[PDB]
Structure formats: structure tokens, C-alpha cells
């Protein structure tokens, strides 16, 4: 599969995003929560609208860092506007 990464190892801002998602916002950007279509099949392949994307703030202007969520609560880290993904392990 993809690499696993511990939630506590992610940047403070990525964790902030994880917490806002758990909270359902309110979100800092108008594009927070739009569908991610996984057009490159880097995440597991699912039906339309399975994935949504959320900005991880970069002390910067909106930047490249993202969390993507799946429909059953999967969370993935991408620092590079979807070029690479890690699956976030909420256990560590």
C-alpha cells in the first residue's frame, strides 16, 4: 500500500486540520471540503465523491499541504498537493 504515518508525528497544523474535520469546521478556506477525485489512483479506488480535501495551513499563501478524508473516516496526509499520500495512523 501507501506509507503509514502517526498522527502525532505530523505537523501541528496537520493535526489542527484533523481536529477541525472531527469538529466539522468552521473551516478557514472556501475550498475546504470540496471533493477529491483521486484521478491518479494514488488512494484506494472508490466511487465518485468518496474523498474530500482540506487545507493544512502553511505559515506563509494557501499552499500545497492537505488532508484527504474517505467516506468511512480514512485520513491521508499530502504535503505536496496530492503528488504523494501517507495514510494517517490515528493510533500513534
From TrEMBL:
One of its GO terms (molecular function) is RNA binding. The keyword Signal does not apply. The record marks 62, 66 as: Activator, Transition state stabilizer. Keywords: Hydrolase, Nuclease. Disulfide bonds join 6-92. Its EC number is 3.1.4.8. It is an enzyme of class 3 (hydrolase). Coiled coil: none annotated. This is Ribonuclease. The gene is ribonuclease. The chain holds residues 70 to 163 of 163 of the full protein.
Amino acid at each position: 500500500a501507501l506509507a503509514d504515518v502517526c498522527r502525532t508525528k505530523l505537523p501541528s497544523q496537520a493535526q489542527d486540520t484533523l481536529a477541525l474535520i472531527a469538529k466539522n469546521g468552521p473551516y478557514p478556506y472556501n475550498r475546504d471540503g470540496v471533493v477529491f477525485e483521486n484521478r491518479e489512483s494514488r488512494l484506494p479506488k472508490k466511487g465518485n465523491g468518496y474523498y474530500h480535501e482540506f487545507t493544512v495551513v502553511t505559515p506563509g499563501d494557501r499552499g500545497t499541504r492537505r488532508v484527504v478524508t474517505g467516506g468511512y473516516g480514512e485520513q491521508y496526509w499530502s504535503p505536496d498537493h496530492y503528488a504523494t499520500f501517507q495514510e494517517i495512523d490515528p493510533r500513534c
